């Protein structure tokens, strides 16, 4: 899986304050990991459709958030989209 | 007529080596005996068979033996 370790690190590196394990800001970064991870997997497992679905859902979930985050606060969106590095 | 449950003490059914223990689940033919004959739970019966299969692969348990005297 993902290292329960570096998972924390992801949460850590992206969060407004200690604890905070569910900010929009986090969830994004937090999914994005699991995405890119899956992404890279499918890249070799092309024939693994089932899982692909999940990725589509995952990309979806984060699509929503990133929207809500843009919709609510444009400032910190322009940060997260870029720190994370997406929207291409 | 005789549940294989109250037939033996406490053991690890996830173990795939207690040949003596396991044989106690495989009839006089080689068949992985039913639930109706070891009474185990759903959850139990499973991890059981899962190992019993494992076993046969190492060679400890059989796959079938001949049906004896009729």
């Amino acid at each position: 899986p993902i290292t329960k370790e570096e998972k924390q690190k992801v949460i850590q590196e992206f969060a407004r304050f200690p604890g905070d394990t569910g900010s929009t800001e986090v969830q994004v970064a937090l999914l994005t990991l699991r995405i890119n991870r899956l992404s890279e997997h499918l890249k070799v497992h092309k024939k693994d459709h089932h899982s692909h679905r999940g990725l589509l859902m995952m990309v979806g979930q984060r699509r929503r958030l990133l929207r809500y985050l843009q919709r609510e606060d444009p400032e910190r969106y322009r940060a997260l989209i870029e720190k994370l590095g997406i929207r291409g | 007529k005789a549940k294989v449950k109250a037939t033996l003490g406490e053991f690890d059914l996830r173990d795939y080596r207690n040949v003596e223990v396991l044989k106690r689940f495989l009839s006089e033919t080689g068949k992985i005996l039913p639930r109706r004959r070891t009474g185990l739970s759903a959850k139990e019966q499973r991890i059981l068979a899962k190992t019993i299969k494992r076993a046969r692969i190492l060679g400890l348990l059989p796959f079938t033996e001949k049906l004896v005297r009729k």
């Binding site: - | 796959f63 079938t64 001949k66 049906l67 004896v68 005297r69 009729k70």
Partner: protein, 119 residues
């Protein structure tokens, strides 16, 4: 060729004819017989009566090869299966046992259209 007290008797229980071959300890036929060998044809060869006469005519010849004991093994869910065996009693020869080796696929080759019954 040689005579031996210890032997083995194989029963082949088809539906359209049952047959038996009697072999030495190793597994090498000394004699055999079957419903046709008896004198039948097609369906009649399926009769358990023939299955009697067979096992006898088998054992019968077998006896004159010094055969006395004969660990029995049957294969075939056939109709004349146990009568083939029954005949090995009345035969007059000491059956060391009775086994059913009747072979069974652990789910392998698709079978004929007929024997397609599973689903």
């Amino acid at each position: 060729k040689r005579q031996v007290a210890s032997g083995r008797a194989y029963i082949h229980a088809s539906y359209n004819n049952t047959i038996v071959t009697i072999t030495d300890p190793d597994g090498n036929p000394i004699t055999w017989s079957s419903g046709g060998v008896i004198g039948y044809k097609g369906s009649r060869k399926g009769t358990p009566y023939a299955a009697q006469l067979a096992a006898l005519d088998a054992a019968k010849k077998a006896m004159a090869y010094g055969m006395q004991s004969v660990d029995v093994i049957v294969r075939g869910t056939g109709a004349g299966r146990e009568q083939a065996i029954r005949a090995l009693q009345a035969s007059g020869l000491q059956v060391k046992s009775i086994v059913d080796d009747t072979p069974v696929p652990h789910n392998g080759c698709r079978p004929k259209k007929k024997f397609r019954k599973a689903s």
